[PDB]
A paper describes a structure:
Here, we demonstrated that alkyl gallates such as octyl gallate (OGA) could act as potent CysE inhibitors in vitro and in bacteria.
In the first step, l-serine is converted to O-acetylserine (OAS), with acetyl coenzyme A (acetyl-CoA) used as a co-substrate, by means of the catalytic action of serine O-acetyltransferase (CysE).
Residue numbers in the entry:
A (entry chain C), C (entry chain B), D (entry chain B), F (entry chain C): 5 to 261
B (entry chain A), E (entry chain A): 5 to 262
The structure:
Amino acid sequence: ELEIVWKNIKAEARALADCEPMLASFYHATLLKHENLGSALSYMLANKLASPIMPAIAIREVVEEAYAADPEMIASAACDIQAVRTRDPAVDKYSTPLLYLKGFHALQAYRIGHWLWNKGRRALAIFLQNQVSVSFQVDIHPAAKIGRGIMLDHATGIVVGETAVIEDDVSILQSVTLGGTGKTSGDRHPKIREGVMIGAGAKILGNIEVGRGAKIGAGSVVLQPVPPHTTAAGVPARIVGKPGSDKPSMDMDQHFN
Amino acid sequence: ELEIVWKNIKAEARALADCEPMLASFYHATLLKHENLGSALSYMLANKLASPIMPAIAIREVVEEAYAADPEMIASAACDIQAVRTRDPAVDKYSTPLLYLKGFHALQAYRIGHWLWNKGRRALAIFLQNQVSVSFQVDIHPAAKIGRGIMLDHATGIVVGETAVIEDDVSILQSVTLGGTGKTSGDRHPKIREGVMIGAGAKILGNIEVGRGAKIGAGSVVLQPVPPHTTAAGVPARIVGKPGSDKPSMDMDQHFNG
Amino acid sequence: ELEIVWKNIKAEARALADCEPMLASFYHATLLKHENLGSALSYMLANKLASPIMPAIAIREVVEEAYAADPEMIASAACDIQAVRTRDPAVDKYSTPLLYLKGFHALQAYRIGHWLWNKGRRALAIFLQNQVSVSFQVDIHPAAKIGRGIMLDHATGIVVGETAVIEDDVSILQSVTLGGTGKTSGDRHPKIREGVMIGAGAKILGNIEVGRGAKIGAGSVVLQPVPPHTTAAGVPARIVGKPGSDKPSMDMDQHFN
Amino acid sequence: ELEIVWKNIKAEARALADCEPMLASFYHATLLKHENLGSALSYMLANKLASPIMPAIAIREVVEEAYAADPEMIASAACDIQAVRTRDPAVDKYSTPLLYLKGFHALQAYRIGHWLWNKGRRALAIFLQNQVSVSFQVDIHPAAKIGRGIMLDHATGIVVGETAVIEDDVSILQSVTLGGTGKTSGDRHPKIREGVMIGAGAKILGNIEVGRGAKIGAGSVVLQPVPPHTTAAGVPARIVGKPGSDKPSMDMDQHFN
Amino acid sequence: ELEIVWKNIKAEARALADCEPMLASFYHATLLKHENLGSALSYMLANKLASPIMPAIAIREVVEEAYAADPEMIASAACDIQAVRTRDPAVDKYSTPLLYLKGFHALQAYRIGHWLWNKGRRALAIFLQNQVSVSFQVDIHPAAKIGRGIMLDHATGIVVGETAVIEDDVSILQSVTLGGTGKTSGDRHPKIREGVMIGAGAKILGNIEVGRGAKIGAGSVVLQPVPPHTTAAGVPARIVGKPGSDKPSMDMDQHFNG
Amino acid sequence: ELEIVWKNIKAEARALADCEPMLASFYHATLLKHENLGSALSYMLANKLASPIMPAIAIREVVEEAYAADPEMIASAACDIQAVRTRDPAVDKYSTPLLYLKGFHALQAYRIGHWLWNKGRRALAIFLQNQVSVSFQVDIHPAAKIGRGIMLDHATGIVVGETAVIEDDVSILQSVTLGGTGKTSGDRHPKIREGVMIGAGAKILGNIEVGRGAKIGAGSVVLQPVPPHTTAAGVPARIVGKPGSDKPSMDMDQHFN
């Protein structure tokens, strides 16, 4: 439920703003002067994406236009906040993803890019993709189709290509590629279905399925489809076992055979 | 020819300025204002390299001096733009690499650093190497010898050491290391020959040859030479097959055998 | 000794001012104007951790405060400079790590955040952790315990988690993850003992021991303990040989079998 | 009416985007993207009152808050635009004051500070007063009472003190001081009544009356009251004639005897 | 000749870089790097005009285009540098105006705005006028016609309106207004002829002639024409005497009779 | 007494930092984290004089070097704070000059420039003079000799030339020139003796004396010496009267005949 999240964040914003006098005016700015999650998200994205080419105030107008035309982006972000909080044991506050975690920021920046792309504003979407790549080291093509409840933990070196699909409740670590094959357009990127966990450094290549609740071991190179509820690992990857739960995204157990 | 790529780019820029109002001026300053590819390149490298330590306007003189001394660097950039357009299916416009792709920027920044290193301005070349590492997440030592028609797609994590060689028409993906062994000076990094494709996350270490037309599979760790027209894959890498084409850099087929 | 490293840095700085007119004032400000290593480290961290939120002038004051209270951090930095100079054949000068190398800058930033974390100022330590991840592409949790004589060569994509330990005289390359497992707090990150070399791309996951003088091969995924004076390689990693020396961190031999 | 001024501004903005490629995105961001005058005023004040201390994105929120609570400030701005357009023969367009003229920008910044001063937020009002003095070279104390239809032409070196009053339809040129006397609080600054024209460099000092339709000559130093419909000039100023019209602010005739 | 001033400047810059370490790089980038006065001017105007709205690197193209179209603007700047060096006793170096004096910067920024206005790029010229007003506190309308060998000493508060004319070898101090009357278009600002000196705070209003070799005393308010080789002073100004020299702009004698 | 001033400022800094959450981190930075007036002055000058050419951290080192070699500059600034507080009825807090008033800031910037000039660092002093002119619109040549207890109220358009002298306890308003004659070097600027008050827009030209406790009317052009305890006014200036007190700088009575 959306309002829960926002409330917690405000409480946390009070408790914390006393402690660091250095940060006081930063907390008031990012969390305390806003009345909904949407206002805060637009604030942080505006500051995060600001450039000489397009300053913060101009970006915030684009982002607010996107949130007004599609309020479900705000709800997706709330689910993404919850996913990081519940899955990442280094995060126990709802405020942390929104303030600090570049993976969370790159994810919400993609959503604006995606919206822009589906409305025909593709030149702007590509500009934002490549700026997010420079600034947060996450390169997600704005045509990719990404659900909600996604954790991009650490996030540096993530690549998601044009025709990729990432369904709800997926967990992805640093240096993961959902990448293409060939020199031609068309469907050529992975389909990552609900509940999948992808470990650090995994490279998944081509228009292949990674089925519901599968787990991909860290450092794996997946060139063939991976059935649902299965664990794949190695270079190249083979089936080595079965995950310990229904949705490995939720448990983040990195072990494989 | 240089002239075509440049004309194509100008055509694209006119269409782009008319369709996106937030970027009309950006497109005008970076592309429509200029009369040749050399002038557009110096503009984009200047801006993206810019730091408090060294501002855009100072960088631009350095870059222009380099292009006046060695205009083959502009012809090299033009081959690199064409490589990305023909080999990367996410790119349909000649202008995209020049405007947006950090791997293309890093590579043309390398060429400036290389020109400086060879002239004896090593201190400045090392500054820029490390500026490029922070700004574009590509670490290419300026003593490396890198040819043209090179694509660095996505590019985050790419490392290319001091003594590496990369010949013409090579394609390289994100998190590729062309890396060193040992604590000693002298040749210790790979020599990558023409037509080679290197998949994402591959690690190639030491003074070893990767022959013409070879393919290195994603996530591979290559410790021994790879014969021409051969496919290597695994940790550590073994010869597992032969590529489907004479120049796998052109085709970007990522598949390889068990 | 500090005095040695520092004298070498000043001599090199004098020569560099005559080598490159464009950077003479830069070498002056960063090196020639200072009386000791500590003052030049604080100057460098100030300008590199400078944000719109917190400016260079204010961060220097926090770094000076930490160096006064614990001057061993300055001596740790000096050992880190010597480590890069002696181990990295592309670095001959002592000034190079201090001026340019983002792995060296990230490692010293960590020490500031680790000090703040230990004094209970966690909001600021987590703020800096994530700043460093964005600016230098190194993500080190401040609660990690990292010794001295550490080289982080090239450095981009390094991730070190909350409960990791890195003892003295370790060499780590780009895209190395010292990473977690599970969704629970507790010991869950690697323990990297003295003398260990970790090759580019290695992923080491869970609360496991990499013992004295071990070598982890490039691209390897380590899920079980690695005994002392042993080479581990593969995905997943298994024992494949013995290092050619007692401290592979000092020799940087990437070969494995 | 607001609607008129605003429609004129948009029409001019459309033409300017085709006149100058270099500034097309600028005209778009500042004018074409907005739905009313109020939203464009807040955008302009944000980017012009932007500081390292307080960013554009945060100042816009304070300006929007003041315009919601008191929308007559927006209508005052519109009268100020018409005043410059009708009175200044070098300004034909309505967009020009809004885009470029520092006197116009300073005057609208004042209204924000004057509102803040009246709500008791004086630290912020004094902060902005001095920001405007530095950035636009206009020093207006926020407690001054300034009406609407005011032209501050060229504007550099204008000083208006704490207890000054400027009624509607006044024209003031560069280097005009509406200034104090003494070291004590209390009424000590001029009262400038409706229709008055003040020439370049005039110094008007103390709690004195410059009555309806008076003209103050350039370079004059006014120490005693000036009766309505009278011309004052000299150092010190004495009465020298009568203005050629009932509202010299509207005619801008600099001649005196 | 242009060549001398430029050589003199380069000589000065070498000495300056060796003596002040905090500014060695500044001096190198702004002066020692360049091979002619035109290139140094475009560099300094670019940097000082720079705004979030328009960055240095974009300004510099505009400026260079102007100097390529009309290189007399560089010869004009060189006469202005010489005017400041010979007439301002606080300035002994040819480099000081170019580096530091905001009145010299404002004036060369005007020349760019004037070139743009005359070409039909009026919107950009008005942008720059107002950028210069905020950054250097000098408001000079770009339709004004201003010659060369002009000194604007200190310069804060200077206002020059749309229809003003300033001929060669004129010296002007801070808070001088060459100002308008009325709400109507057409000539309404002063025409200042050759050799005129205008003291600090003088206000000169309307379409009136100030003749060759005249002197306008500090703090004066001039409402009627001033004959050649005459001294005007007062509020309002009266003819009070004759200047000590044929060209008071050269001598900068501020004295005038009761 | 110096410590008084500093104390008051800290008390004021607490009382005020509660009120404006926007400014909280700015107050902590400018006033609360410093233990003496010298540290605060160096902070504010560093931020105020920062440029791409010479960032804040580098400037602060120059300024601290100057304050260590000559601590009387810090005391002069304290007397300048007191002068503004006691003479300007719009200022009643000791913090206001230090935080906000560009006249105060330009004065203390001159002192650094003066120190630099007397040590042979003239190229740097001239760079700072011209930056202060651009940034605060006060142009003071660093060779001028300026005492303590000086008020530069409003300050925009002030010019003080190379050979000028300003003794202790002088009050100067906006647009005042202490200016030169001729094209030759040598003594050619005014000598302004103790207690003088100079009104807005006054132009004082040549190597002439303005005697102890004299008053110069606003808008006056002074080309001849002005005896002690005398009032001069007009264009050109003549003796018109005698000031109402011993030191007109203290009372700020702008009236003249």
